[PDB]
Write a protein that binds this ligand. Structure first.
Ligand code: U0V
Ligand code: U0V
Ligand code: ZN
Ligand code: ZN
Ligand code: ZN
Length: 459
């Protein structure tokens, strides 16, 4: 049970307004044939154009909401909308393009999908709320066949060119005119009552319905993300490395140890309340502090209410010492906090657009994160960059330019001249810091935090 059987039944009720008379009894095999495609009993890696929910979730990076609305059907112009906000008008002769024939529309589709997906995935998964026109329009821009490799590289082929009779991946498809071996899923097969807008609007207020095909395409993909990542959560599913995943996670671990160690040295809290990850380890193992853990899984729908996390009767007194919220998203942080909050607004290959302002952050696992809210941090301040070290000034073992920095909190800098070891360590740490920030993470600390209190730890 790996792929979706072509002999699986497809409910056609949602298709009968564009396609009147459609048989109630329908398989994927018959539907694909009706869409104008011939599979020829091919055992060559492409068993079905349609995929399961499980296969769709594994390939969330490939998701592109797609909707087709009749502007006037072989005789009428069609408006093709994509969750990228693009609207193309195909004539059979929020970006809105005027009517053009299919031979030019298909070139634009290949360019748009290649630019959106080359750094995300090896495929495209068209996420539909199928009514008919979108399925019958696929023959105009899609070619199918056996699984192939790119003409210029080892990646699988996602595009085809009728000019050169060649196949290309998303990175080498310039000038290509056909989408090759796409995948698709119809959200209406999941069992919903009512139309797209009524189901989407139950969980999201950020996407509106301007009555254009891209609006519906956006709502469709948002609803699919809500069903698969918000109301249902599977953190076991692994996702491939496509960018700076390893460096970001390593930087996150370096920054957490640095910031927590310095906060304990500067304000000598007798107790730390570590709220979040049920699998958390002490990030500063040598610290004197009483380390107490509280379990909370990552919230994917709304941010946790601090009243529910802390009250209803543990040290009980969270007000004593400091609270560490490392990627634990709460509505309003207490004043005595050390916080790392992922900013859902960040533009990156890891962060996909999500539901109701939130974003789907995909790094080893998929985490739908609730919308970033600046008010969550009213009792805190932004944590400034600093590097702290009490390790001995000793090189051991990359050329050098002398480091001068007020934020290099070391015994050598206190003594008036940064040593080579602490300069190399400072520069490596600043790189890890910038990587973590640029990835979308934001750091916040209790208002009394002052790095001036770290200089007296060298006496
Ligand atoms: O937002 C991004 N990617 C679009 C994903 C997407 C869009 C529309 N419909 C489905 C999926 C992005 C932004 C900045 C950098 C890299 C990115 F990948
Ligand atoms: O949930 C995340 N990370 C798994 C460990 C974890 C942390 C905190 N609370 C529970 C669990 C996570 C979510 C969004 C962005 C970055 C992340 F690291
Ligand atoms: Zn290639
Ligand atoms: Zn939405
Ligand atoms: Zn030094």
């Amino acid at each position: 049970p790996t792929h979706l059987s072509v002999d699986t039944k497809f409910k056609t009720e949602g298709l009968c307004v564009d396609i009147p008379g459609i048989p109630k009894d329908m398989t994927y095999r018959r539907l694909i044939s009706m869409m104008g495609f011939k599979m020829n009993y091919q055992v060559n890696g492409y068993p079905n154009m349609f995929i399961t929910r499980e296969e769709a979730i594994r390939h969330v990076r490939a998701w592109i909401g797609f909707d087709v609305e009749g502007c006037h059907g072989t005789n009428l112009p069609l408006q093709l909308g994509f969750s990228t906000g693009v609207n193309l008008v195909a004539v059979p002769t929020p970006l809105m393009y005027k009517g053009l024939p299919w031979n030019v529309v298909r070139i634009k589709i290949v360019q748009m999908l290649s630019d959106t997906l080359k750094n995300l995935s090896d495929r495209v998964v068209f996420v539909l709320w199928a009514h008919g026109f979108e399925l019958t329009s696929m023959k105009y821009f899609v070619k199918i066949g056996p699984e192939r490799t790119c003409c210029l590289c080892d990646r699988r082929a996602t595009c085809f060119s009728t000019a050169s009779d060649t196949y290309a991946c998303w990175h080498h498809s310039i000038g290509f005119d056909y989408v090759y071996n796409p995948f698709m899923i119809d959200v209406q097969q999941w069992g919903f009552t009512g139309n797209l807008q009524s189901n989407h609007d139950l969980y999201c207020q950020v996407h509106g319905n301007a009555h254009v095909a891209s609006c519906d395409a956006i709502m469709t993909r948002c609803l699919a993300v809500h069903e698969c990542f918000v109301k249902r959560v599977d953190w076991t599913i692994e996702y491939p490395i496509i960018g700076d995943e390893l460096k970001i996670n390593a930087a996150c671990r370096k920054v957490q140890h640095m910031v927590v160690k310095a906060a304990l040295l500067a304000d000598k809290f007798p107790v730390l309340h570590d709220i979040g990850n049920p699998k958390a380890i002490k990030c500063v193992p040598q610290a004197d502090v009483e380390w107490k853990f509280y379990d909370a899984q990552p919230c994917s729908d709304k941010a946790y209410k601090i009243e529910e996390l802390f009250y209803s009767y543990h040290s009980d007194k969270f007000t004593d010492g400091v609270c560490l919220f490392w990627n634990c998203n709460v509505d309003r942080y207490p004043a005595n906090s050390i916080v790392c909050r992922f900013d859902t607004r960040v533009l990156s290959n890891l962060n996909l657009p999500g539901c109701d302002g939130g974003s789907l952050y995909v790094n080893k696992h998929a985490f739908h994160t609730p919308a970033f809210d600046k008010s969550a941090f009213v009792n805190l301040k932004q944590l400034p960059f600093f590097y702290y070290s009490d390790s001995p000034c000793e090189s051991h073992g990359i050329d050098y330019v002398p480091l001068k920095s007020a934020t290099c909190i070391t015994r050598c800098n206190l003594g008036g001249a940064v040593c080579r070891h602490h300069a190399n360590e400072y520069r490596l740490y600043l790189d890890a810091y910038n990587m973590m920030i640029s990835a979308g993470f934001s750091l916040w600390v209790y208002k009394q935090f002052d790095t001036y209190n770290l200089w007296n730890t060298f006496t």
